[PDB]
Amino acid sequence: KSFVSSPIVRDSTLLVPKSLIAKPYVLPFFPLYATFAQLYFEWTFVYLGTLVSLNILVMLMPAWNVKIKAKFNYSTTKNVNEATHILIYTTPNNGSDGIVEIQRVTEAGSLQTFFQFQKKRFLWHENEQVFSSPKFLVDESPKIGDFQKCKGHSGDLTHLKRLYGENSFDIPIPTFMELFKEHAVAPLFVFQVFCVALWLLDEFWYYSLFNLFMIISMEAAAVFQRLTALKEFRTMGIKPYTINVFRNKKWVALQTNELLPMDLVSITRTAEESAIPCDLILLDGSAIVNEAMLSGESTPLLKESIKLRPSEDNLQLDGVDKIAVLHGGTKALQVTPPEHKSDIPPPPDGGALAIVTKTGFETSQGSLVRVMIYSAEDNKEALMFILFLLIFAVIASWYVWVEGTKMGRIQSKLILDCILIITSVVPPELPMELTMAVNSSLAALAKFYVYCTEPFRIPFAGRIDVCCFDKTGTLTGEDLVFEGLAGISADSENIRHLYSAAEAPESTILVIGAAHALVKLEDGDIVGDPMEKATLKAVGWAVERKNSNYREGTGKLDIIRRFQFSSALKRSASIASHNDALFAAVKGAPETIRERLSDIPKNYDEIYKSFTRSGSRVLALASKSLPKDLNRDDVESELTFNGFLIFHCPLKDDAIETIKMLNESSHRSIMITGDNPLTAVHVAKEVGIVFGETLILDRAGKSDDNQLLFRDVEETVSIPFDPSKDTFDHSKLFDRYDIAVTGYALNALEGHSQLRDLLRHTWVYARVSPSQKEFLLNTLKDMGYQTLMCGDGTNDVGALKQAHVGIALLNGTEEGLKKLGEQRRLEGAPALKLGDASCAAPFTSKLANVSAVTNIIRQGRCALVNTIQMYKILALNCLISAYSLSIIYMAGVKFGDGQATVSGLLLSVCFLSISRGKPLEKLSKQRPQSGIFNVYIMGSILSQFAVHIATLVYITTEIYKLEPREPQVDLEKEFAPSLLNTGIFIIQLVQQVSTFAVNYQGEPFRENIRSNKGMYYGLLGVTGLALASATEFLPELNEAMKFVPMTDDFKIKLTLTLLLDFFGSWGVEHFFKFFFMDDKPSDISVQQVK
Ligand code: BEF
Ligand SMILES: [Mg+2]
């Protein structure tokens, strides 16, 4: 018997399929059918009906639960040589159970059984009799000699291709049937089809068939739209590109999909729209990677080789040995070929050779994406609404049935009346209205290039409480840019004074162009550190083919001999030559240059520490006159200070305004980043997330013991802390200082009693791992708030998936998108990359600016308002119609077709015009309501209904006082012009006007009613028709509308009753909205001065 062995599975039972007659429902039902046939050879037909129903239900019973499907279709066996399926019982926190097909294929005279569950390959090992996932060499504790003594793969590697598979990231998308099955369960669709069945049971067939066709077409179109969106956006951008791989003792060029562990490849300078293939270890050479996408840190690291380490005893640690690993999904800005000769020849390119370690969904990025996809996880308002309407319809049907029994009609007509009531309990224009609303919201979002794949999350963006943010890539760029010199002065009048350019003396502008490592090849190009290129271009230098560069606007320059950048004693050097004299320029970290030059200025330390404590990365450069080969020490004997070079990632010109708009709108915006605390605090303080002084929780000492320390940005205040003894002194910490928790401190405070009281008062989290953003969002969702996440990297994929509404900011300007669209149209500015963050986030702003959050919230407010107003109007109209049927139909009241159609057309015009409205430009501090079931809305609905009923009863009593009552009445008579018909129809029109005019108006969330031309014209027309027919202004139209003339006193009474009805309904609705509105922001949204 099989037994899968992995941390994902819990138990496993083999399965062998059963024949068609072996299925449980089919064999037994034959005795019941034979018994029914014998009894048959009236009341018995319902028995065949229920028997067919139960048979069809047992037929479809498996599809709901997979365990039931395995119980019914397949039978459990304990021999893997014959089982064809296997039931995988997963662990509690890893996806759900499943049925996967056991596959087989013969290789080299021996077949190999295997399957694949959650993209994790399994294989049948006979000696252990288990399905064991592949285990890699770097997973265990490997000897560094085992890595240094590698020479690539050789022979026929057809078993490795089966053990490990291919290096491909292929995400599967759902099909049409599995996507429509989710829409075929909502109560709206079930109620629609049930009502269609009830109606066709007695009414015609052609109209029912057309209606069913329409219902099918609506769902088909919706599912097709959702499927198109999913198929477009649910994928990561991974295009294979040729690389040189050392196989069979020769450098042969394979693709990226054909990489296996322990394969020697040659990585070069990674071009655009590409990244490092998979997890590599640097066997020889050097590089400068950019981990801003996978890790979240802005500075480019400097990786080194592995050859200098002793191969005998040392172990590949991934601790001290983390300066040699290159993850997958990072850009390599520069690569240096090997220096000395090795056993294998150097690569044909200029790249460095490395060793593959993991491939596919086993790497870091692949593992994050896989766990997000597979290991992931109310709709009761509509159900309660249907229950409400059905209760009222039941009371209506009970009354009408009692009255029909007391009058003496047949049972069939009473049944048909009950069915008519239950069918008209909901208007037919509800599903088309919901579809128009969803499509209008989607087409309004798609004007800012914001595409959504879960359209039911747009109403979620109306009551957002906490707005989380990512720093690198979302608020700031991920590339260092120049800022300007510093320290070039002798006045000390100010520290932060940045001479941009064209203001430095000749010495500084010669040193910035003399101490560099860029070179121009013979074909024409420039290779080197990109920040060095940026500064050399901003200063305005032009490099030539020879090492000598000129055309700086001042003169020419030549480089005699240059030095390298060492790992230790980090600095550089160069010996340049000028037409005037000769000097040697030095450029390196300031902490090493300060102890090297003779003349120490008075503001060296002040300027350095002022610019290094806030994000920026300075590079102090110095020079020295050199009179006429030489070593490096005597060149760096004594120098002369010249200035600094300050770089930092610049803010987006849209972040400040967006965060200000969110602050002035009762939103609490926080920051969750992976950068060091200083840069995060600086950017948050510059954008507007924190205002006053800020404290930081980080490790106090160095080694261990989890003892934190509250410390200012500077060295002013230092409050210790112990996660087992001390408790958060709210009075002196939270009221006087903003704070920012790091990742180590947030990890050491696990299990603390006041962790939530802390999380209620921190706005910046720096240096958090990809698995702590999920924890933070889960805690913020358990606290009761509604969260939002807006990021772009791979580390915050789980955070984007866990939030109530997630947004993934791609790259691309507006003009670039317009040009790309124009080119696409003509065929039918770098391109945009889909990345890994767009696979989890439902929304995906194809632009880069941060205003997508504001636009999405502004659309969510409008969508929620529209939903609430539609629910309220439908409830009121349905109650009024139910009463109208129940009571009025029991009297001799009926109208001709002409008046009915003439009024119904305007009613439908207004009802359709309701949905079309434009949201205001300004975000308001008041938030809409969440759901219809509360005190305010329900009270207002019931009170409006009571007022309408009282008015109708008053006019009925008045009319019965005027004209006789006629106790004997019949419901089969045809239409006859009378006074009661007019006196009721006028009030019907007035009530159907008031139910919109009183309940539509929402000022703070969308434009006024007068700006809605359609609905305004409709209501004006209906009220004008009613008021002109009441007082008989045009007798011709009254005689054309089959309205009988009336006396003056009754017309006056009717007009006064109309006015009183309208004004009373409006007044009591305003009363409830004024007394029990309760639109208050949360407690975390208030902003109090400290
Ligand atoms: F810095 Be963020 F987490 F991308
Ligand atoms: Mg990012």
Q: Is 793 labelled as part of a ligand binding site? A: yes
791 lines ligand 1 (CB under 6 A): yes
DSSP strand E in 639-781: where? 640-643, 646-648, 668-669, 671-672, 694-699, 708-712, 718-720, 738-741, 762-765
Q: Is 248 labelled as part of a ligand binding site? A: no
**Residue 89, strand partner residues:** 11
Nearest to 978 by CA among 902, 1039, 1043, 896: 1043
Give Dmax (Cα) for the chain.
130
Residue with tokens 């800005």: 333
User: Measured from the CA of 768, which atom of ligand 1 is nearest?
Assistant: 3
1012 lines ligand 1 (CB under 6 A): no
Report H helices in 452-577.
506-514, 530-539
CATH number of 243-375: 2.70.150.10
* Alpha carbon distance 346, 344 (integer Å): 7
Question: Please, what is the angle between helix 187-200 and helix 380-407, to 10°?
Answer: 20
Residue with tokens 């602050």: 663
Per the structure block, which two tokens stand in for 519?
A: 């070179």
User: Measured from the CA of 795, which atom of ligand 1 is nearest?
Assistant: 3
Nearest to 564 by CA among 760, 761, 366, 336: 336
295 lines ligand 1 (CB under 6 A): no
118 lines ligand 1 (CB under 6 A): no
> What phi, psi does 75 have (nearest 5°)?
-120, 145
- H/E element holding 358? strand 352-358
* Alpha carbon distance 90, 96 (integer Å): 6
261 lines ligand 1 (CB under 6 A): no
Whole-number Å distance, alpha carbon 1018 to ligand 2 midpoint, is: 51
User: Measured from the CA of 791, which atom of ligand 1 is nearest?
Assistant: 4
> What phi, psi does 692 have (nearest 5°)?
-85, -140
**Residue 582, strand partner residues:** 577
Whole-number Å distance, alpha carbon 365 to ligand 2 midpoint, is: 14
Q: Give the three-class secondary structure for 1075.
A: helix
CATH number of 481-648: 3.40.1110.10
* Alpha carbon distance 920, 1007 (integer Å): 6
Question: Please, what is the angle between helix 851-883 and helix 897-915, to 10°?
Answer: 160
471 lines ligand 1 (CB under 6 A): yes
Rg, the chain, Cα only: 38
User: Measured from the CA of 675, which atom of ligand 1 is nearest?
Assistant: 1
Whole-number Å distance, alpha carbon 833 to ligand 1 midpoint, is: 17
Q: Is 760 labelled as part of a ligand binding site? A: no
167 lines ligand 1 (CB under 6 A): no
Resolution of the determined structure in angstroms stands at 3.3
DSSP annotation of 651 reads B
Whole-number Å distance, alpha carbon 474 to ligand 2 midpoint, is: 6
User: Which of 293, 472, 689, 809 gets mutated to test ligand 1 (max ligand atoms within 8 A of its CB)?
Assistant: 472
Task: Report the amino acid identity of residue 121.
Answer: R
Whole-number Å distance, alpha carbon 296 to ligand 1 midpoint, is: 4
User: Which of 795, 800, 809, 850 gets mutated to test ligand 1 (max ligand atoms within 8 A of its CB)?
Assistant: 795
Whole-number Å distance, alpha carbon 470 to ligand 1 midpoint, is: 4
User: Measured from the CA of 672, which atom of ligand 1 is nearest?
Assistant: 3
Quick one: which ligand is closest to 470's CA? 1
Nearest to 360 by CA among 598, 623, 165: 165
Q: Is 472 labelled as part of a ligand binding site? A: yes
* Alpha carbon distance 457, 52 (integer Å): 40
Residue with tokens 């309205």: 1043
* CA angle centred on 928, ends 923 and 931, rounded to 5°: 155
Task: Please classify residue 143 by burial: count the beta carbons closer than 10 Å to its beta carbon, then call 0-12 exposed, 13-18 middle and 19+ buried.
Answer: middle
* List of long-range contacts for 77-82, beta carbons under 8 Å, 24+ apart: 77/1, 77/14, 77/15, 77/16, 78/1, 78/14, 79/1, 79/14, 80/1, 80/2, 80/14, 80/113, 80/124, 80/129, 82/16
Q: Is 491 labelled as part of a ligand binding site? A: no
User: Measured from the CA of 470, which atom of ligand 1 is nearest?
Assistant: 2
Nearest to 967 by CA among 895, 884, 892: 892
Per the structure block, which two tokens stand in for 567?
A: 């790992």
370 lines ligand 1 (CB under 6 A): no
User: Measured from the CA of 773, which atom of ligand 1 is nearest?
Assistant: 3
Quick one: which ligand is closest to 471's CA? 1
For 323-356, give one letter per residue: b (16+ CB within 10 A) or e.
ebbbbbbbbbbbbbbbeeeeebebbeeebbbbbb
Q: Is 471 labelled as part of a ligand binding site? A: yes
User: Which of 291, 298, 474 gets mutated to test ligand 1 (max ligand atoms within 8 A of its CB)?
Assistant: 474
Question: Please, what is the angle between helix 935-962 and helix 851-883, to 10°?
Answer: 30
Active site residues: 470
Whole-number Å distance, alpha carbon 160 to ligand 1 midpoint, is: 37
Q: Is 796 labelled as part of a ligand binding site? A: yes
Q: Is 849 labelled as part of a ligand binding site? A: no
Per the structure block, which two tokens stand in for 691?
A: 């205002």
835 lines ligand 1 (CB under 6 A): no
Q: Whose C-alpha lies nearest to ligand 1, atom 3?
A: 673
Task: Please classify residue 56 by burial: count the beta carbons closer than 10 Å to its beta carbon, then call 0-12 exposed, 13-18 middle and 19+ buried.
Answer: exposed
User: Which of 767, 769, 773, 796 gets mutated to test ligand 1 (max ligand atoms within 8 A of its CB)?
Assistant: 796
DSSP 1005-1038: TB--GGG-HHHHHHHHHHHHHHHHHHTTS-HHHH
798 lines ligand 1 (CB under 6 A): no
Per the structure block, which two tokens stand in for 541?
A: 């230098």
Whole-number Å distance, alpha carbon 366 to ligand 1 midpoint, is: 18
> What phi, psi does 603 have (nearest 5°)?
-115, 15
For 666-686, give one letter per residue: b (16+ CB within 10 A) or e.
bbbbbbbbbbbbbbbbbbbbb
